[PDB]
Symmetry: D2
Subunit: 395 residues, 4 copies
Amino acid sequence: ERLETPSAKKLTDIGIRRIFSPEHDIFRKSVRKFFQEEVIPHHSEWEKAGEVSREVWEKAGKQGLLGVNIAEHLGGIGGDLYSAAIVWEEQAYSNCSGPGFSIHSGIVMSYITNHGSEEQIKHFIPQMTAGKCIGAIAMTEPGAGSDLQGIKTNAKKDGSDWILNGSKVFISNGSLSDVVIVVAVTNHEAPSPAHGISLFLVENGMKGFIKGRKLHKMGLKAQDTAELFFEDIRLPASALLGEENKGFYYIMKELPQQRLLIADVAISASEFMFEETRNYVKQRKAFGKTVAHLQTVQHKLAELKTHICVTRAFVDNCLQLHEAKRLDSATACMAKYWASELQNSVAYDCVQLHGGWGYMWEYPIAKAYVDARVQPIYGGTNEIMKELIAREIVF
Amino acid sequence: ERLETPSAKKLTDIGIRRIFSPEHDIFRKSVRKFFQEEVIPHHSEWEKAGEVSREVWEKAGKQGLLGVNIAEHLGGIGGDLYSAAIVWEEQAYSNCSGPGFSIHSGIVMSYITNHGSEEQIKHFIPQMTAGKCIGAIAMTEPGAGSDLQGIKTNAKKDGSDWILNGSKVFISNGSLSDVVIVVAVTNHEAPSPAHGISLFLVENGMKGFIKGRKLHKMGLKAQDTAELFFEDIRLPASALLGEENKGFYYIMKELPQQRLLIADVAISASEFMFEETRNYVKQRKAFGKTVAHLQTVQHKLAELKTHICVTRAFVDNCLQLHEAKRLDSATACMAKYWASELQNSVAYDCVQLHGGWGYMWEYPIAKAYVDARVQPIYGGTNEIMKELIAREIVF
Amino acid sequence: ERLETPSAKKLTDIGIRRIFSPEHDIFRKSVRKFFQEEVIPHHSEWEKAGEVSREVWEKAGKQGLLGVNIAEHLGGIGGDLYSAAIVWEEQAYSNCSGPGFSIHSGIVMSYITNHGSEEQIKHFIPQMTAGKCIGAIAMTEPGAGSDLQGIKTNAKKDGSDWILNGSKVFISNGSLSDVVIVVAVTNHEAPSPAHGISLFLVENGMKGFIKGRKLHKMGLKAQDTAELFFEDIRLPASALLGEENKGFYYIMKELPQQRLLIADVAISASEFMFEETRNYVKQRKAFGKTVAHLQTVQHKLAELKTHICVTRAFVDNCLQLHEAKRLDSATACMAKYWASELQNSVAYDCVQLHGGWGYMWEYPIAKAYVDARVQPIYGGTNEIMKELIAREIVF
Amino acid sequence: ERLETPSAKKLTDIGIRRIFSPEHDIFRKSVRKFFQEEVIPHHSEWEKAGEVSREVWEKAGKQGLLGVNIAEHLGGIGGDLYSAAIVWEEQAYSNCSGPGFSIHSGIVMSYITNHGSEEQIKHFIPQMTAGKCIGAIAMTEPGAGSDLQGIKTNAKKDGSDWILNGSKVFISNGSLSDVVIVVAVTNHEAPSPAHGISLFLVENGMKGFIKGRKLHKMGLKAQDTAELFFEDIRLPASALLGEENKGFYYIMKELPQQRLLIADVAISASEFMFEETRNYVKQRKAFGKTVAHLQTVQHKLAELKTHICVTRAFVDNCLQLHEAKRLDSATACMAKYWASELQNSVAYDCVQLHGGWGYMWEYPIAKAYVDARVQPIYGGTNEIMKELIAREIVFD
Ligand SMILES: Cc1cc2nc3c(=O)[nH]c(=O)nc-3n(C[C@H](O)[C@H](O)[C@H](O)COP(=O)(O)OP(=O)(O)OC[C@H]3O[C@@H](n4cnc5c(N)ncnc54)[C@H](O)[C@@H]3O)c2cc1C
Ligand SMILES: Cc1cc2nc3c(=O)[nH]c(=O)nc-3n(C[C@H](O)[C@H](O)[C@H](O)COP(=O)(O)OP(=O)(O)OC[C@H]3O[C@@H](n4cnc5c(N)ncnc54)[C@H](O)[C@@H]3O)c2cc1C
Ligand SMILES: Cc1cc2nc3c(=O)[nH]c(=O)nc-3n(C[C@H](O)[C@H](O)[C@H](O)COP(=O)(O)OP(=O)(O)OC[C@H]3O[C@@H](n4cnc5c(N)ncnc54)[C@H](O)[C@@H]3O)c2cc1C
Ligand SMILES: Cc1cc2nc3c(=O)[nH]c(=O)nc-3n(C[C@H](O)[C@H](O)[C@H](O)COP(=O)(O)OP(=O)(O)OC[C@H]3O[C@@H](n4cnc5c(N)ncnc54)[C@H](O)[C@@H]3O)c2cc1C
Ligand SMILES: CCCCCCCCCCCC(=O)O
Ligand SMILES: CCCCCCCCCCCC(=O)O
Ligand SMILES: CCCCCCCCCCCC(=O)O
Ligand SMILES: CCCCCCCCCCCC(=O)O
């Protein structure tokens, strides 16, 4: 009944890929409509402002695009992993990297609902599903980003409170965030920092919580990445997320999802770029016929489509495993690493096929190129992905 | 209940991969035992001889390894495509490329049962399933392989018999074949040679049918490959396979299975090489530790394992599609091309990891390296695969 | 005597490479000071402005960095090719791509003093060497860049004047230019586009000459690139550069220098990126020790340094050949193609070695990454380079 | 007044590349003639025997191909480094990896003349220059090839004699060698073998010296590679090459020439494959034209030609530096590593361009493919090459 991407008219067609159902296709169509009409037309302006509007967040919240795979009885929408993936994919197909929906719904809401108390869940989830409370997660610091145990941010108890001090960097949704999950060292006496880390829900408005100026980056112009500062912030007992000192444990449990998320975003962006480029060369007149008639272009496009389809098959297998809660760390790392790498190889060749116009911001491929470059870096660099993958091979 | 290759203890473990059932596992174990006892111990001798014995072929037929996925009511063993794939895979896992079982079972027996008459099927299939009648297919000629329009071998109608003249090169199982499917032009006056070709079943013993000497090759030392010559062979009317002048149609229908076969053999060979090399470096002492303790080696193995697992996912997806009769030519070409390229990339890096010993015929990786080099060439060059894949992209 | 880049303390050290003299080093040192003191400190401002100041051009001219290798008695600065290259290289080593000096001096001024008259050489060369007259070169058009036959810009002659019409795209120095060498079709009923093309000097001010607004690109933020328009510009008889319909001949003779120029800039930017990155990883610590101590990082740096040094050797060989006026089109195409691809390969790996900081505009590697991507596109795409290189191989 | 490979009619043409002179071109034509007439016609037979004839060695000696760049007053032919390189290159252009000439002349004879005694030089060099005494060098052992400290072969002083025990593997010219420079531990009491290693001249015939049978390899079919065993061989004081415990110092001084040698052989092999393949596709008919008319084939050839030419330029700069005795270990490592890697990349693409025929031993490209695979491994693996190169990048 369903075709796989290689046989589809377009890698981005609706109604394809075996892991989806007819009900998923319907939802897919609506999400695609949302990005096409509510995101794509305002993106150029958000790029200029360096951030998206609160309006689109509330719009996404109203249409039900936030907290999709978060249990309904907890304040989420209640869909399965496949529905949540559709939202990641469609955003990638729109080539609009500004809105930080997936970090919000795929990571932050996930930590809160999986390890938060009943009161934290009741206080945050509905607001986040509505898109009125924007979430962010802050682990990385100026001195440590792959070496989590090297974290310096710290929190020390003062009765029932916690005095939080330190700073984070490269925080997505940094500017617009209303709630930020902060990783901090709570036990300087623990044997290893891995046994002395906790998670704290820091809210915009607490005294001492300062948001730095938006960072100037080579890409992701509309994503408000920023530095965060904590100045002797007195945090109520309710700010502590999960058990004290069990923070590393919670991060480890959530990592697999974060990696698969990045992986699907990466391969979806590649499918976008391929179709975008396919279209360009078949339209670009040259030597009387289209650039698409040149043999070298045809072989190049074949190479790109093959690698893209091969990788999508693996990512879809991972989405299936994760749905069944059977996707382990190593497999998640393979997907993240291989897909993020492919995304940059595809972007590079696709810009080339566009000639000079590929270097112009007017053309989508231009921003696809700079937006792609960040994927092999965040969420655990690919060097780290290979390290983790090698553990089961040699040890 | 079933792990995929990334999570298994070894990429070659039995009981892994969701496309197989526990009944397939029982069968795989038995086939693996067969190669371990009836092929591996005698392969060195066969390399020297330049061909395997008739004995192993008959043992294979008796044990039920030939004609798997060939209709039982047609004289085959029956069983699904997955069972047939298990035999391709296990031969790859044994690193013995001598026995030409794959071409015989997956191609020649296929052409006969799908497009042959009751008489032809009754005459060939049972003895082919028994391993007493070895099959080969001959399309390639000295003048051209990638140029189908350049076939010179021809058959002239003389009364009710066919007069066949010409020659073919690079024919696998060419030396010990008992029946060979020959592609020849039967209508030179046809608009397109694609509509003027026919298939003929030539048997060993006919007058005018001459087998040339075994060709000296860089690898596949035990695979008897040779040139064939047809000198005014008077073929009975029962030598024609299928309808006259529709040979191109039949070839086009079998190609997808041929490409998929090559793809699975390639990815399976890669999995063998990976585990073989993984084992070697964990055992090779160096600098007070094992080569496997070196970070560069760990990352190299991670890269290899990741790419192999990713391709395995696409190939398994292709097997599933083919089992459903839903695998088209373009997808088959993607698997053939991508897997055969990976196979050589893997072999190169695995030889490197063995150091000097990787150049010694004594070590399996050495013959794996030279054996791997033929895959990107036969069954349609990877260059031809790209042209075919590009066809749907631009037209 | 002198050391080559592999043996030097740093690839960018002054006093290395056999093709330079002690006198060249002194010039080198003074050129290095200029960029550090007059370019680097203000580049960020120009990036935001979208163009450099006319002041920096006058400072460059006054200091004798504009028009090197241009005959002194022609109003130039004199000096061999090695001196002109030093200015290209040092601008690369400063990682400041804003000022279009090399085009102005290495391209525009070369055309004027090689195929221009004394009335033109006397008029333009003096003020161009002073940085008061900024030149450009318009060849590429919206319809085609690579397909030379696709030129729509035509110059119908009227009496002794010429009626210029058409448009250009991607014109570097498009905003600051005071004189632009325009390529237009003069002889339409010409057999080949070699007997129908002419070079014109369109000075700023002539009616009908319309400069479009600066183009928004992914990189070269400080390089004013614009679209140029021509709506019936009456051109004097002196506006014609060289012989009518002889443009092709002029361009073909200058192309080598342009290719060598891009190649040296590409390889120099690679040497800069390497030393920048080598320094970064030696000062960055993680998981206990400096990133530079990781074996993977070490081998990566060894690969980068090796490829960079091998390519530098080729480029210097090309500078020598060009000095003796013996660099052909093919050899120059090899240099431009290989060095431009290597530059992006180096940039990618160097961004990865900086981790997240490599994505921040604050770090030089970030702008170096996006600035490098233009090289394989302009000055003739690398695809065109291969075509040209292939011509003598098969034809 | 000379063209660089990029501009020549063929990358293998005589009279090109700035480092050579018209005198060199004359010698070049002569050497090329030697391989076409005395080697090419018999290589197939040698591949089956797994070793070349002692006759081709003596013929090479008589025509002055052995000992080039080995001082004439020392028993060699003399000539500069460029002349010795011509012999390495021409053998590669012939696509005959059988004759172990380069090793014998560019390595073994070099050790002897650069660190041997006047007596050792008198006895060995003359007959080696004549091709009467074939040389081999043995460092690698069963359990250690990239690990120096792993060497187990050892020699103990017994009076003025040396007792040698151990074994080596992968020894080129192993079967027909008359003299072998053996690396052995002479002082394990030292902090590192870098100060406890000595070189010895082991000769065929000495009691206890055993040659193993020829090893079966994927390529280099006519190159007699073998393992060697030393069983309490009583070596006279004269067997010691150089000073006791200074072996490492000598090996260290010779490595750059060894790496440069492999480097030149690697890039030269690539030049041969390119022209061989270029010829094939221009001659191969397809679609009523030649495979060379396909745009993909043209671009692929341009890519190969460019990389080969870029690498040749670097290798020639290294030849010029070594001529002046100014070639660094790190620089020589860059050449050995980069050229051997490119050689295999070129081999792979060229086999592909030949279609099925590239898999047939009949065609030159097939043996060139398996012959190339050895280069990234011996003379120090490419991984070791990177390690050495990284030293000055990260430390100091
Ligand atoms: C735009 C953007 C958005 C991001 N969003 C978030 C976010 O929302 N929240 C958050 O907390 N962080 C986020 N990050 C930070 C990101 O996760 C880190 O940059 C990333 O984890 C890399 O850490 P680092 O920058 O400290 O690099 P480092 O850890 O310093 O690593 C630098 C280099 O050393 C290499 N290296 C280090 N260790 C090894 C090793 N063991 N083996 C081999 N190589 C190694 C790294 O791979 C890299 O090549 C984001 C970053 C960017 C750029
Ligand atoms: C920032 C920037 C600055 C520039 N500055 C100048 C300048 O100052 N003056 C000037 O005149 N130009 C300049 N250019 C323009 C530049 O020279 C052209 O963009 C370049 O020549 C490519 O032409 P195109 O963009 O039309 O690509 P196209 O010709 O459309 O090519 C598009 C794709 O088709 C491929 N293709 C086309 N022909 C072949 C072929 N025959 N074989 C295989 N593939 C082929 C191309 O390689 C590319 O992959 C600049 C460009 C940029 C981006
Ligand atoms: C045909 C042939 C001819 C030869 N001729 C000679 C000869 O005449 N005389 C002689 O003495 N030797 C010769 N050799 C031997 C050759 O020098 C060695 O095989 C080579 O140095 C590799 O050593 P090894 O085989 O012990 O591999 P090992 O040292 O075991 O290395 C195995 C793998 O580990 C890798 N590795 C080891 N160390 C590191 C590291 N530090 N970092 C990252 N990776 C590492 C190696 O690169 C390789 O990938 C020859 C070899 C062959 C194949
Ligand atoms: C060991 C071995 C076993 C084999 N077994 C069989 C068998 O049993 N029966 C049988 O019939 N055949 C068999 N073959 C033959 C094999 O199918 C052919 O060699 C293969 O199809 C390639 O054809 P060719 O060798 O004629 O190469 P050619 O067609 O000459 O191609 C030569 C080069 O040109 C390239 N080229 C051709 N067309 C294009 C294009 N249009 N665009 C770009 N590049 C192109 C090719 O890819 C290749 O790079 C086998 C081959 C080998 C080596
Ligand atoms: C380019 C838009 C990508 C949106 C999904 C990003 C998912 C990973 C976010 C960063 C996670 C981390 O680094 O902790
Ligand atoms: C390495 C052993 C592979 C055995 C299966 C080979 C299948 C393809 C055989 C050649 C088919 C053809 O080219 O017509
Ligand atoms: C990154 C700065 C490069 C400065 C030198 C550019 C030389 C080529 C300019 C474009 C030439 C052309 O496309 O006609
Ligand atoms: C293909 C023929 C190559 C001839 C030169 C080989 C040079 C390296 C020989 C082995 C050196 C060593 O491993 O000690």
